[PDB]
Every structure is written in C-alpha cells, then in structure tokens.
Amino acid sequence: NPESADLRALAKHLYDSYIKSFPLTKAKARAILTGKTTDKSPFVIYDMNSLMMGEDKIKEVAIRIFQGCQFRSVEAVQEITEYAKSIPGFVNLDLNDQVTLLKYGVHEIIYTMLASLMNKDGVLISEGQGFMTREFLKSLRKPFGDFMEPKFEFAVKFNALELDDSDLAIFIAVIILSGDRPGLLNVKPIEDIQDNLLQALELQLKLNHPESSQLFAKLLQKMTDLRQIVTEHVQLLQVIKKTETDMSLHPLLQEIYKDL
Ligand SMILES: CC(C)(c1cc(Cl)c(O)c(Cl)c1)c1cc(Cl)c(O)c(Cl)c1
C-alpha cells in the first residue's frame, strides 16, 4: 500500500496545518459545548440583559452583534488563507487563480467550520468564552433576525455526519481546490490537486468512520447546502447596505462578495 501511504501522509499533513492555522477546533468546541469542564464552560447570552451582562465579562445592538460576526469573518479569512498556503501545490498556482480560489472558497469553509461551534440551541462566540442562543438571534429585529438561521439549519444536518477535525481538514482542502470556480485562468492543475485531496478524503473517511456507509458521497453532497447558505447571505447583505447606509462593511469582505 505505498499509494495509500502517500495519501495517509497527506491527510496527516493537512490535519497538522489545520491544527496550526485554526485556534478553535471542533474538539475544543465540543468539549466546551458538552461540559467536560468546570474550567471551559461558557457565559451564555440569551436575552438583552445577559447581553449587557456578558459585556461585563469581555452603535445599536442587533448591529453591534452583526458587525462582531463580520469581523470574526475577516479574522477567519486570514486563518483559512494561512491554511491554504499549506495545501501542497496551492502556492505554485497562478497567483490570480490563488486569489480566485480564496475568493469563492472562503465563505463555504467558514460556515462548514462554524458548524463545529454550534448545536441546535445556539453557538459559541468570543473564542468560546461565550455562547449565544439561536433564539436570541431570531429575536433580533428584521432583517437581522434572519441571518444566523440558515447557518444553524446547515450545522444541524451537517453535524449529523459527526466529522472530526482530521476529516474536516481534508474536506476544507477539497473545497478550496475547486476547479469549477469562475474566471479560473488555469483549471487542470487545480483538478489534479483536488483529485488527490478527494482521494485522501475518501480513504480518511473509511479508515476513520468504517461503519458509516457512503459518508464520502454524503459529505460531498453537502456542498449544495453550503452554496445556498452563501447565496442567501449575499442576498441578505445586498439588502442591509440599502436600509442601513450608515453601517460600514470591511473592505476585505466587500472584495470577496463583489461579483460573487
Ligand atoms: C457568531 C460567530 C459564531 C460567527 C463567526 C463567523 Cl466567522 C461568522 O461569519 C458569523 Cl456570521 C458568526 C462568532 C462570533 C464571534 Cl465574535 C466569535 O468570537 C466567534 Cl469564535 C464566533
């Protein structure tokens, strides 16, 4: 199995860069989320009072929340970018294509990973020091009431796959190296890499979840739900910028969303 060996090694490599690039792994998240802890347990924000009291420990309000999420996104992009660099082959591509892959692949990954920080009842924030309930979010005045919902929706179905960090590291790699993205100057070197990634992913999922029939197909199919989330988000923003023309947007995100 020297063929296999090569892939395993690649899987191992991606996991490592993953752990090195992302401060809040699904493992830390699930530990805080469940209570393996007298030391990890989060402060919960579930209403306006606790919001005010959460602020005690570490604009408007619905807007203040939204811009916090937006800024975390910016921070998240930085992380993913550092991770991509580590994907064997990626930095060797046409610079323009590197930029194009990041442009499209970054949100998909954000939400995939955002799922690690959620369960049906809500989502970790402030690096896990806090926990905002799904219900508090819905309560936010339209249109912000609607922004975390579709994300929770995905995370619930997605989390059902029970992927761990090591499966995810390969999966976000497969996402970045997507050849079908618009305006790619040079697709084939991309497809060749992703073939390898896909091969690695496949192997990884059956070694690590052998009693889980067709998880690979099941997991590949989730990429439809991701683009939907992304699309709605972008629709949501098109609207916000017209109702709240006093609310800013981070130029980086502005650039990612442009012509998306
Ligand atoms: C709310 C949440 C989960 C988030 C993150 C991203 Cl990246 C995102 O794009 C969206 Cl809409 C929501 C978040 C917010 C903060 Cl302030 C934080 O420190 C952490 Cl660890 C997580």
**Three-class secondary structure of residue 122 per DSSP:** strand
The helix/strand/coil state of 85 is helix
Answer CATH for 1-260 from 1.10.565.10, 3.30.750.24, 3.30.70.1290, 3.40.50.2300: 1.10.565.10
Q: Is 256 in the pocket of ligand 1 (CB under 6 A)?
A: no
Q: Which residues does the annotation place in the binding site for rosiglitazone? A: 70-73, 107, 233, 257
58 CA to centre of ligand 1 in angstroms: 15
The response to whether residue 72 sits with its C-beta less than 6 Å from ligand 1 reads: yes
- Tell me the C-alpha distance between 200 and 5, whole Å: 10
Sign of CA dihedral 213, 181, 17, 150: negative
Q: State how far the Cα of 231 lies from the Cα of 29, in Å rounded to an integer.
A: 26
Tell me how far apart the alpha carbons of residues 238 and 248 are, in angstroms, rounded to a whole number: 13
User: Whole-angstrom Cα distance, residue 87 to residue 90?
Assistant: 6
Exposure b/e, 195-222, CB count within 10 A at least 16 = b: ebbbbbbbbbbeeebeeeeebbeebeeb
Q: Ligand 1 test: best mutation among 32, 114, 132, 234, most atoms within 8 Å of CB?
A: 114
- Please tell me the distance from the alpha carbon of residue 117 to that of residue 159, in angstroms, as a whole number: 10
d(CA 71, CA 51): 18
Distance CA 168, CA 250 (A): 27
Q: Is 183 left (phi over 0), alpha (psi -120 to 50) or beta?
A: left
Backbone angle region of 162, left / alpha / beta, with phi > 0 → left and psi within -120 to 50 → alpha: left
Rg (CA), the chain: 19
Collapsing DSSP to helix, strand or coil, 2 comes out as: helix
Output the known binding site.
70-73, 107, 233, 257
Q: Which of 201, 197, 198, 253 is nearest to 230 (CA)?
A: 253
Give 124-163 as a DSSP string.
Answer: EEGGGTEEEEHHHHHHSPTTGGGSSHHHHHHHHHHHTT--
**Residues recorded for the chain:** 260
Resolution in A: 2.7
Point out which residues pair with 122 in neighbouring strands.
119, 133
The residue nearest atom 15 of ligand 1, judged by CA position, is: 125
Q: Please tell me the distance from the alpha carbon of residue 132 to that of residue 119, in angstroms, as a whole number.
A: 11
Q: Which two tokens stand for residue 101?
A: 């892959």
Contact 144, 63 (CB under 8 A): yes
Q: What does the CA dihedral 188, 200, 110, 101 come to, rounded to 10 degrees?
A: -10
Half-sphere exposure of residue 225: CA atoms within 13 angstroms, side-chain side: 18
246 Cβ contact partners less than 8 Å away, ≥ 6 residues apart = none
Structure determined via: X-ray
State in Å: Cα 2 to ligand 1 middle. 41
Residues 6+ apart with CB under 8 A from 1: none
Q: What is the SS3 assignment for 49?
A: helix
Q: What are phi and psi of 80, to 5 degrees?
A: -65, -40
Neighbours of 144 (CB within 10 A): 21
